[PDB]
């Protein structure tokens, strides 16, 4: 019940024969797994706490010059060296200057000149590699139990810690048994290639190769005062006043340009622990040992009253907040959905088994009524509650939105998107293999291509396919162009 109104939840209606169902968990999204008899529950990944980060490759985004010394010599006298040239904190460049009479020596021509200047870093930024051993995943498993304060609560739920070591934890539900989730945390974000650079109080996940590529002076990051910055010439510019002389400049603070540089990298919260809020991981969760509490409970004769007006979720599932008026502390809510001006059973119950735990508190029953007019009955007697409700929807529209959501998942997860609700069919395996090969070939080609360039390349490929006589090439170009249009229209997230 934790994942209700989340806006990115997507149901997992089908349980496998061996009772394990495979779900891919995203931070923003949600997964409400159902079953024929097991208690339904909405697993949702909280965060990925990363600890014991090892800083490396400190980068200077600012600088300072302090000393600047110059020494120039005459033409055909060789280069003009300085005693500070051998120092490891001075950056300097050779330049030729025209000299002659009235300037120091008789011979006329161009004489060498060197201006060496000490370098101090001032502000700096450090990329931290995430230690894969200490990477930790925390996932909540809230169960649809109809608690009064559970309808959209983010606090309620039993957490299960998952790490690359010991990645299978059997979360102990309060009275629903043990949900043994066997999750694969090595197929999530390839954290071996992401390093967490931090500017002041802000941190980001950036591709490690890109971090190594960005031009800024850098050092070993060994917490040593006054380090030596390799490639420190990037934050100093030497300019010639025509040809008379040489001047050094500190080139200001590159902090804003660094904010612009990481314009597509997702952001981490570094306050407290370096908690990463983006990402995903796959979970094969076993519902072997879940027990439906209230399976042995009896029905209840007394009437029901709903405290607050019935609302609708974004995914069309109704949600009822009803209080029992009886004297039966344990209970099983009767529940039948009657079609308009008739009798039938065409509406499902998204909450597995509604039970009154106490008369003092009230239960949050959630349901998925069928399309169009519907009548929902809570009580079992002649004085049963009647919740009339009408669902604005078209099953074709639901199919379209489901295909759209599946495409959104496929455009992000990629190879593993086929494992979102995999019951275990052999067709899913073949689809996953085909998708993996095609996606490897695709990301081999389109890696580093901006969204506008993806749109352009896709349009060009579609046009090529529409004007190609060879049918195989035409079809290939049409399909790749349409896929590229979709990706470039969704890629920049």
């Amino acid at each position, epitope marked *: 019940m934790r994942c209700v109104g989340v806006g990115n939840r997507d149901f997992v209606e089908g349980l496998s024969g061996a009772t394990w169902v495979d779900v891919v968990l995203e931070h923003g999204g949600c997964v409400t797994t159902m079953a024929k008899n097991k208690p339904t529950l909405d697993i949702e990944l909280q965060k990925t706490e990363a600890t014991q980060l090892a800083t490396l490759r400190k980068l200077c985004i*600012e600088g*300072k010059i302090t000393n600047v010394t110059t020494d120039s010599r005459c033409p055909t006298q060789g280069e003009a060296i300085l005693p500070e040239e051998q120092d490891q904190n001075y950056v300097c460049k050779h330049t030729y200057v025209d000299r002659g009479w009235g300037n120091g020596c008789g011979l006329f021509g161009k004489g060498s000149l060197v201006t060496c200047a000490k370098f101090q870093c*001032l*502000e700096l930024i450090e990329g931290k590699v995430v230690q894969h051993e200490n990477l930790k995943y925390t996932v909540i498993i809230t169960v649809h139990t109809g608690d009064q304060h559970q309808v959209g609560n983010e606090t309620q739920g039993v957490t299960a810690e998952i790490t690359p070591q010991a990645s299978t934890v059997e979360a102990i539900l309060p009275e629903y048994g043990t949900l043994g989730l066997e999750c694969s945390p090595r197929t999530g974000l390839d954290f071996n290639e992401m390093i967490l650079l931090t500017m*002041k*109080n802000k941190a980001w996940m950036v591709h490690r190769q890109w971090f190594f590529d960005l031009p800024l002076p850098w050092t070993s990051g060994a917490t040593t005062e006054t380090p030596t910055w390799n490639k420190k010439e990037l934050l100093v510019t030497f300019k010639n006043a025509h040809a008379k002389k040489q001047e050094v400049v500190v080139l200001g603070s590159q902090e804003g340009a660094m904010h612009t540089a990481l314009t597509g990298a997702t952001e981490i919260q*570094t*306050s*407290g622990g370096t908690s990463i809020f983006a990402g995903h991981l796959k979970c094969r969760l076993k519902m072997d040992k879940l027990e439906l509490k209230g399976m042995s409970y009896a029905m209840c004769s007394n009437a029901f009253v709903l405290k607050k007006e019935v609302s609708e979720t974004q995914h069309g599932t109704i949600l009822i907040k009803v209080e029992y008026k009886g004297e039966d502390a344990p209970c099983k809510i009767p529940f039948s959905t009657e079609d308009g001006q008739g009798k039938a059973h065409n509406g499902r119950l998204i909450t597995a088994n509604p039970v009154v735990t106490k008369k003092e508190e009230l239960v949050n029953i959630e349901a998925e009524p069928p399309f169009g007019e519907s009548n929902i009955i809570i009580g079992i007697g002649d004085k049963a509650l009647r919740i009339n409700w009408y669902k604005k929807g078209s099953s074709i529209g639901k199919m379209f939105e489901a295909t759209a959501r599946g495409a959104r998942r496929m455009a992000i997860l990629g190879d593993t998107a086929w494992d979102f609700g995999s019951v275990g069919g052999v067709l899913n395996s073949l689809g996953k293999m085909v998708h993996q090969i095609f996606g490897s070939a695709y990301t081999a080609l389109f890696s580093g291509v901006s969204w506008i360039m993806k749109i352009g390349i896709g349009v060009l490929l579609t046009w090529i396919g529409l004007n190609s006589k060879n049918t195989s090439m035409s079809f290939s170009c049409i399909v790749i162009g349409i896929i590229t249009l979709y990706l470039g229209a969704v890629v920049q997230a």
Partner: antibody, heavy 122, light 109 residues
Framework: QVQLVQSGAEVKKPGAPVKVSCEASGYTFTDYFIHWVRQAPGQGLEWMGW????????NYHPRFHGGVTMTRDTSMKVAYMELKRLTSDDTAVYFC???????????????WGQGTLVTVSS | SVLTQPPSASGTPGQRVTISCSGG????????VNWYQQVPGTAPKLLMY???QRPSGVPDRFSGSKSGTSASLAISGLQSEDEADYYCATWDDSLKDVLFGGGTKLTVL
């Protein structure tokens, strides 16, 4: 020798602007901030804004933004400051301090002024 | 986040004085702490011109350090002159302003 000397103790009634000044001499004025700290009578110290006299940029405290203005006037090496509408509550002593440009020197203040005490009463 | 510190006191024999500022994860954790001494009626003096660094004088009676989100000023024995109002100042980044401590009236007893 480098030091900061204020304008001198001033008294005004509520709803009257006051222009507290801070003299700077002995060093390169443009290379250091003026952090214009405040201290109420028998109360905790409270920083309220610094200006960069090399450029004139002003970083007011969120509380004092708009209520106060600070001008560098680098010609005479005198970091002026003004209060737009002085109230009865804002009675205090306004020190002017010297700070370094970089991040490590944002919050370090040496060579404070004596502080122009401003009393507000009707 | 606002960094805080309590008022403390100690006897004239300098056993130990522990004067601590506990700031947030943006002000103290990433910026050097700076300690200020204010004898009442006088302008404050820069007790610490950096983290665990003294500008001039009073050695081993004023010695600080920060570990993580908190900073403190340690001692090897106080004297009668060490009675003043102390302030810890750090440059916050989220608020983007210089934060001063709430004050502390250390009295030689």
């Amino acid at each position: 020798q480098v030091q900061l000397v204020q304008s001198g103790a001033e008294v005004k009634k509520p709803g009257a602007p006051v222009k507290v000044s801070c003299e700077a001499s002995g060093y390169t004025f443009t290379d250091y901030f003026i952090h214009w700290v405040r201290q109420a009578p028998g109360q905790g110290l409270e920083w309220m804004g610094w200006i960069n006299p090399i450029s004139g940029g002003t970083n007011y405290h969120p509380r004092f933004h708009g209520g106060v203005t600070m001008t560098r006037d680098t010609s005479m090496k005198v970091a002026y400051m003004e209060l737009k509408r002085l109230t009865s509550d804002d009675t205090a002593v306004y020190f002017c301090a010297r700070g370094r440009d970089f991040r490590g020197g944002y919050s370090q203040l040496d060579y404070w002024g004596q502080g122009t005490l401003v009393t507000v009463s009707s | 986040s606002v960094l805080t510190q309590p008022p403390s006191a100690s006897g004239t024999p300098g056993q130990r004085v522990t004067i601590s500022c506990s700031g947030g994860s943006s002000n103290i954790a990433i910026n050097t702490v700076n300690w200020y001494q204010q004898v009442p009626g006088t302008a404050p003096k820069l007790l610490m011109y950096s983290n665990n660094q003294r500008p001039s004088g009073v050695p081993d009676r004023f010695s600080g350090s920060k570990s993580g989100t908190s900073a403190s000023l340690a001692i090897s024995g106080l004297q009668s002159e060490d009675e003043a109002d102390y302030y810890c100042a750090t440059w916050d980044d989220s608020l983007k302003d210089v934060l001063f401590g709430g004050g502390t009236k250390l009295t030689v007893l």
